Design an enzyme around this catalytic site. Sequence first.
Site, PDB file in Angstrom:
ATOM      1  N   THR A   1      -6.159   4.996   8.605  1.00  0.00           N
ATOM      2  CA  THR A   1      -6.771   5.247   7.323  1.00  0.00           C
ATOM      3  C   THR A   1      -6.475   4.048   6.401  1.00  0.00           C
ATOM      4  OG1 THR A   1      -4.902   6.421   6.380  1.00  0.00           O
ATOM      5  CG2 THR A   1      -6.403   7.687   7.778  1.00  0.00           C
TER       6      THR A   1
ATOM      7  N   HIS B   1       5.410   6.068   7.075  1.00  0.00           N
ATOM      8  CA  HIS B   1       5.160   5.836   5.647  1.00  0.00           C
ATOM      9  C   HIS B   1       4.711   7.095   4.936  1.00  0.00           C
ATOM     10  CE1 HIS B   1       1.919   4.927   8.281  1.00  0.00           C
ATOM     11  NE2 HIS B   1       1.110   5.579   7.360  1.00  0.00           N
TER      12      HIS B   1
ATOM     13  N   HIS C   1       2.006   8.835   1.686  1.00  0.00           N
ATOM     14  CA  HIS C   1       0.790   8.717   0.856  1.00  0.00           C
ATOM     15  C   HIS C   1       0.900   9.743  -0.273  1.00  0.00           C
ATOM     16  CE1 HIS C   1      -1.489   6.298   3.863  1.00  0.00           C
ATOM     17  NE2 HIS C   1      -0.883   7.058   4.840  1.00  0.00           N
TER      18      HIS C   1
ATOM     19  N   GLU D   1      -3.665  12.862   2.441  1.00  0.00           N
ATOM     20  CA  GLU D   1      -4.861  12.296   3.019  1.00  0.00           C
ATOM     21  C   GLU D   1      -5.702  13.423   3.632  1.00  0.00           C
ATOM     22  OE1 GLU D   1      -4.513   8.885   5.481  1.00  0.00           O
ATOM     23  OE2 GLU D   1      -4.656   7.642   3.685  1.00  0.00           O
TER      24      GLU D   1
ATOM     25  N   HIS E   1       0.825  -1.196   0.000  1.00  0.00           N
ATOM     26  CA  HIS E   1       0.000   0.000   0.000  1.00  0.00           C
ATOM     27  C   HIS E   1       0.861   1.248   0.000  1.00  0.00           C
ATOM     28  CE1 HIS E   1      -2.717   3.101   2.110  1.00  0.00           C
ATOM     29  NE2 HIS E   1      -2.894   3.156   0.802  1.00  0.00           N
TER      30      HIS E   1
ATOM     31  N   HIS F   1       3.413   9.915   7.468  1.00  0.00           N
ATOM     32  CA  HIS F   1       2.794   9.488   8.722  1.00  0.00           C
ATOM     33  C   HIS F   1       3.806   8.836   9.665  1.00  0.00           C
ATOM     34  CE1 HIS F   1      -1.597   9.318   7.125  1.00  0.00           C
ATOM     35  NE2 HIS F   1      -1.197  10.606   7.342  1.00  0.00           N
TER      36      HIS F   1
HETATM   37 ZN    ZN Z   1      -0.710   6.517   6.750  1.00  0.00          ZN
END
Ligand code: ZN
Length: 237
Positions: free
Chosen positions: A175, A70, A72, A82, A40, A95
């Site tokens: 999330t 990580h 996004h 996000e 992901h 994050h």
């Molecule tokens: Zn995250």
Amino acid sequence: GTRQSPINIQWKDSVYDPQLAPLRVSYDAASCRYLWNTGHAFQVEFDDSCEDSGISGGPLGNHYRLKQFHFHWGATDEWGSEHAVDGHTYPAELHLVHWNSTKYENYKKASVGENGLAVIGVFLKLGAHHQALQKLVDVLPEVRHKDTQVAMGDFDPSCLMPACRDYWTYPGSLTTPPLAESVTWIVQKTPVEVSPSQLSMFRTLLFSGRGEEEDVMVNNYRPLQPLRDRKLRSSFR
Ligand SMILES: [Zn+2]
């Protein structure tokens, strides 16, 4: 559920809380272990073997240990984050996941527990090249397919944080599944600059495994959630 992340940070719903103790961020760079493609996103993992490494202060009642961090992003420089500050979204978001070592026995338990996590969200914005981030960028070619990893060695996450530490805070959730509502969110108001080329590299990771249909890793973010009846605090006036 009621407490779900991410949300839209709006000027109008924020309420300064002068009671918030200053946030003390201190990580042991020596505790770094490996970077990897989770399927992901890519993550840097840390050895959380009972160390001072982690955060305290702010809306946190006790120290929380650094476990991992990580990113996004989107298929374009125009979106990818996000969270959004008043309808505005950034090309990416970092994050920094920490777990409440005081209330829970282990990370696996804290992550789904009532007050098990504390995540600092840091928005990323196009701008000046970012030296600290280059170390990470330099190893991504090694982790294109999901489940693939590489060894690391001494990395201080703080190098990815803005100098100004003004933040917004609220109760949220992961999330990503299980989507547990166990996260005290610490979102940083000030974005960090990175260069397009650093960001482009992100977009070469894959959702698929070795010997599978090439499924590119873009738009790995979750849609906005209503604030509901939750209190969005401001550490700043
Ligand atoms: Zn995250």
